[PDB]
Amino acid sequence: QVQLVQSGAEVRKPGASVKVSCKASGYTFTDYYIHWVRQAPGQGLEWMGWINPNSGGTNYAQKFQGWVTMTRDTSISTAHMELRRLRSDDRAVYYCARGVVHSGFEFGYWGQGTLVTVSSASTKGPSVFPLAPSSKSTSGGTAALGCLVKDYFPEPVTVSWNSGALTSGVHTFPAVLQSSGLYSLSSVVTVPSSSLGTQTYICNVNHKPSNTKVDKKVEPK
Amino acid sequence: STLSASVGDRVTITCRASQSISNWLAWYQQKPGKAPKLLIYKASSLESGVPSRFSGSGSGTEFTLTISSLQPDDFATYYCQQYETFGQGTKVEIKRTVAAPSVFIFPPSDEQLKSGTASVVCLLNNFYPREAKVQWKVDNALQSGNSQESVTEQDSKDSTYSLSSTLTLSKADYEKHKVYACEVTHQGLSSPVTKSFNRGE
Amino acid sequence: DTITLPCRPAPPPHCSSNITGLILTRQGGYSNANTVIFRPSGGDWRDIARCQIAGTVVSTQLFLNGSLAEEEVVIRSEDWRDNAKSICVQLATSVEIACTGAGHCAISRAKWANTLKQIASKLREQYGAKTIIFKPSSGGDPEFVNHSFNCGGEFFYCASTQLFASTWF
Ligand SMILES: *[C@@H]1O[C@H](CO)[C@@H](O)[C@H](O)[C@H]1NC(C)=O
Ligand SMILES: *[C@@H]1O[C@H](CO)[C@@H](O)[C@H](O)[C@H]1NC(C)=O
């Protein structure tokens, strides 16, 4: 079983450095090349370079020549890639890939990916605000209501409605980075209009990095 | 570069690359939030653990990936690769009937209006296709540059999309205007649907 | 003028040999600016045995006391467009390297520069009328980032930075 396990998510200040690990298992670590491919949020795959685990040699792309350093540690079968002079546009996911050939570019084995975000912001709990339903939110026979999770850092954050007892019709939108450097999302849920005057809806927002757990009750009108 | 196909349709994705003596061309499939999977190497040869409905052919500079019959598992994004160069992705989504959006608007909460920033939220729920247009209006003045949109992925059952547009104003600017409205244009709507409110009511 | 390569430890003058070939690696990323960069091989020992032109002398980057070509410089590779496969270079006329014995091995700067242009010319036949650039090694273990070899059972390491720092239009 050939598997590649990478390090967890990393948050770095701009201009610092990040060292990502990629541990190999199930095969002879020193025989096969190891590549590194980054992927922007909605953009495509970008090859950065490979490293020769036996000789230690490397071959970076010209776009990254000078900003990337690839090393390996044969005692632990782990390949390291360090990126220096970090910038805000370097926020992406970095995969390590191994080919089916000894030194082929046909990548048949991938790591799970390492999310690396570069931001100047500091850890801050979210400010949870309700999205109250009213006549302006009763398009037809159904109604809509939600919670606005605003100004938190870093990702992620979990949103629950009535402590998992309400899942049908729930939509939790992906987080969007605001101009202030803080994340923000909205989680909505659609219920019958008759249930507004009979059911109570409380959203449970949970932020692990800041250790802040917020509960807000949404009321009609 | 989006492809709307149904279960059972035939899909041929064409990749324009350089000609190779050995026809070096690889295809990949990627799911949301998952690492890519190798489907085909050397233009035509398949991969172990890949269904036979995938195939490839490459003569000269035209290389194509073909799915004989789309299954629910095949709806993803596909990349072609030639050595270290990767191409643009081609997302294959599920095709269904047109569903008009359900428009909802939310004024800023009283709890928020203590911090100095007002947030109005316009919600478009359960619609197909993804191409929708939201236009903000403040005192019948068209707005631009002061909003952010967020779309969900295609739902697993009804195969629809959901969209949220948040208008962000300062409390000084919010309390200087009365009527706030988001207009919605969609193929399912015979006319633009407008949802507005008055500040304080 | 000569080119003095720092070597550790000091190789005796009788370990001087003839340079018969090189093994290179093309830099990844197609610049599309008629510019191709070549560095010493970032490959292991599998790349050297593929060339078959290296002699019985254990050696990296440069080939010592190997087999020469006939009347013309020959360039070979398993795939020319795969930057992961090394590029074997076989010289027509050898380049003599003489080690002083005080931690330095000398090479004729004129002869090395003349053979460097003929390698850049034969590479243009494989990649088009482009500018050829030679840069130092990208890194690695001491046996591969440096020009390494053995001589009677003793291991030697020489820095070859001065051999790969030229641009040819
Ligand atoms: C190469 O051959 C010469 C001439 O026979 C010899 O003196 C020298 O030691 C050889 N080089 C090596 C590295 O064995
Ligand atoms: C190198 O080749 C020359 C002829 O070109 C030969 O005389 C000599 O012995 C060889 N070896 C050395 C170490 O110069």
Side-chain angles (χ1 to χ4, degrees):
Chain A
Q1 260 275 46
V2 176
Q3 68 188 194
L4 304 177
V5 186
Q6 302 190 210
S7 53
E10 266 289 311
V11 191
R12 288 295 147 193
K13 305 291 186 177
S17 71
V18 53
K19 196 173 187 180
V20 189
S21 296
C22 173
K23 182 148 161 23
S25 305
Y27 68 100
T28 298
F29 172 71
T30 85
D31 279 332
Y32 287 89
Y33 287 40
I34 297 298
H35 301 247
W36 289 94
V37 177
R38 67 176 290 188
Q39 187 179 40
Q43 295 81 302
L45 303 171
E46 194 168 44
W47 173 84
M48 310 172 72
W50 54 256
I51 170 172
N52 201 294
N54 184 237
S55 65
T58 49
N59 189 348
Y60 318 116
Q62 298 173 30
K63 190 178 185 298
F64 300 96
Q65 183 68 21
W67 281 354
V68 58
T69 288
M70 297 176 192
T71 53
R72 97 286 184 190
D73 208 312
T74 62
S75 66
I76 54 197
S77 295
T78 301
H80 296 96
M81 182 214 56
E82 191 191 271
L83 216 177
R84 59 183 48 85
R85 201 182 187 183
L86 288 182
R87 311 191 144 168
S88 302
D89 293 357
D90 287 357
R91 186 265 174 90
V93 166
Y94 295 85
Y95 296 98
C96 58
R98 201 213 85 177
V100 302
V101 188
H102 275 342
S103 62
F105 273 87
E106 24 256 340
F107 307 139
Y109 310 88
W110 296 72
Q112 78 280 11
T114 290
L115 177 61
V116 173
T117 86
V118 175
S119 176
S120 301
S122 306
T123 301
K124 182 177 187 59
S127 302
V128 181
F129 304 113
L131 302 171
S134 63
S135 61
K136 314 299 183 173
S137 303
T138 47
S139 183
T142 59
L145 55 94
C147 276
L148 174 59
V149 184
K150 192 176 188 300
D151 296 327
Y152 68 96
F153 187 89
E155 282 192 301
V157 63
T158 33
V159 193
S160 181
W161 285 94
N162 297 332
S163 299
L166 178 65
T167 57
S168 178
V170 178
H171 289 108
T172 303
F173 290 85
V176 48
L177 175 64
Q178 295 170 322
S179 60
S180 56
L182 296 317
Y183 288 102
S184 168
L185 71 86
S186 179
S187 176
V188 304
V189 49
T190 51
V191 304
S193 300
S194 58
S195 59
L196 286 184
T198 65
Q199 294 270 313
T200 65
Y201 300 95
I202 302 137
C203 74
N204 314 103
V205 183
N206 200 320
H207 194 208
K208 210 277 182 178
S210 64
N211 196 13
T212 57
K213 278 54 157 158
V214 196
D215 288 14
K216 275 293 195 303
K217 173 188 175 182
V218 189
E219 302 188 280
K221 194 55 187 175
Chain B
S1 296
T2 307
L3 189 49
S4 297
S6 301
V7 176
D9 286 358
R10 217 168 196 257
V11 165
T12 297
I13 305 174
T14 304
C15 180
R16 220 77 74 103
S18 306
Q19 186 176 358
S20 174
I21 279 280
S22 56
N23 298 285
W24 211 110
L25 203 288
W27 294 91
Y28 294 85
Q29 176 194 79
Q30 187 170 38
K31 294 298 184 65
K34 287 299 195 294
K37 283 186 166 299
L38 177 57
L39 288 181
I40 273 171
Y41 53 72
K42 287 285 153 47
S44 72
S45 297
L46 211 60
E47 260 285 291
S48 60
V50 173
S52 61
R53 57 181 181 268
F54 291 91
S55 64
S57 67
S59 65
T61 38
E62 269 199 318
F63 306 87
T64 54
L65 173 63
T66 300
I67 307 175
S68 66
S69 184
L70 276 186
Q71 285 209 348
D73 186 60
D74 308 328
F75 291 107
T77 305
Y78 298 86
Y79 297 90
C80 53
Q81 178 202 22
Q82 186 163 79
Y83 297 110
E84 66 267 27
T85 298
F86 283 92
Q88 306 279 43
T90 305
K91 177 186 175 183
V92 178
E93 69 163 24
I94 329 169
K95 160 174 288 301
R96 58 150 287 160
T97 67
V98 167
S102 203
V103 183
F104 314 97
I105 189 153
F106 298 96
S109 61
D110 298 326
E111 196 77 296
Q112 187 194 177
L113 288 180
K114 299 155 53 184
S115 56
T117 299
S119 301
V120 190
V121 178
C122 191
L123 171 63
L124 282 62
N125 193 46
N126 296 6
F127 59 91
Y128 189 100
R130 188 183 254 233
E131 291 71 37
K133 211 56 61 206
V134 181
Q135 182 63 59
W136 282 102
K137 296 178 181 179
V138 166
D139 285 337
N140 215 18
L142 274 64
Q143 298 296 324
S144 179
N146 48 10
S147 50
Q148 285 185 325
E149 281 174 18
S150 177
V151 187
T152 58
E153 266 156 44
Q154 208 171 17
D155 193 292
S156 307
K157 277 313 170 79
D158 50 359
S159 301
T160 54
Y161 293 95
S162 295
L163 190 146
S164 69
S165 184
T166 307
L167 183 77
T168 293
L169 304 164
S170 65
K171 188 165 61 179
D173 278 85
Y174 173 70
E175 309 200 296
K176 259 147 52 184
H177 303 90
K178 170 189 170 188
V179 47
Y180 295 79
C182 59
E183 195 183 69
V184 173
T185 297
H186 193 259
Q187 186 168 339
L189 304 174
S190 62
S191 298
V193 172
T194 302
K195 292 275 189 169
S196 58
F197 71 97
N198 279 312
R199 171 175 52 87
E201 289 78 335
Chain C
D1 188 69
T2 78
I3 300 181
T4 81
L5 309 181
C7 296
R8 300 156 223 95
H14 63 75
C15 291
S16 304
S17 48
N18 283 328
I19 303 168
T20 62
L22 304 89
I23 174 174
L24 299 172
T25 295
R26 193 185 73 253
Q27 178 116 22
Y30 189 68
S31 186
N32 199 22
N34 288 18
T35 322
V36 200
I37 298 96
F38 292 92
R39 304 182 187 268
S41 177
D44 41 12
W45 205 258
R46 298 174 269 164
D47 296 43
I48 289 170
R50 227 69 157 187
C51 304
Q52 304 187 40
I53 57 141
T56 43
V57 161
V58 201
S59 180
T60 69
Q61 292 188 25
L62 309 162
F63 297 138
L64 304 179
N65 287 2
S67 61
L68 283 175
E70 290 174 337
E71 205 72 15
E72 198 82 312
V73 196
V74 182
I75 313 281
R76 304 174 191 183
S77 175
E78 203 179 335
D79 201 316
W80 291 99
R81 339 291 318 178
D82 199 334
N83 70 77
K85 303 299 175 300
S86 292
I87 294 171
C88 306
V89 179
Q90 191 183 38
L91 307 164
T93 87
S94 67
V95 173
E96 187 211 12
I97 166 178
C99 298
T100 64
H104 279 262
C105 298
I107 280 177
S108 173
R109 180 180 298 278
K111 171 57 62 182
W112 181 243
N114 181 73
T115 60
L116 217 68
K117 164 145 57 153
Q118 283 161 1
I119 299 175
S121 63
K122 302 293 155 272
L123 286 170
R124 265 185 270 198
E125 315 186 327
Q126 311 285 352
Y127 298 99
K130 305 194 174 195
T131 305
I132 311 298
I133 299 185
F134 297 98
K135 289 189 179 180
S137 169
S138 186
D141 278 351
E143 198 194 1
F144 290 88
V145 69
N146 296 310
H147 166 53
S148 303
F149 64 94
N150 83 330
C151 189
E154 189 175 24
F155 307 152
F156 299 95
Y157 303 85
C158 299
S160 57
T161 307
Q162 304 186 272
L163 298 178
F164 309 103
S166 314
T167 305
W168 309 90
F169 294 91

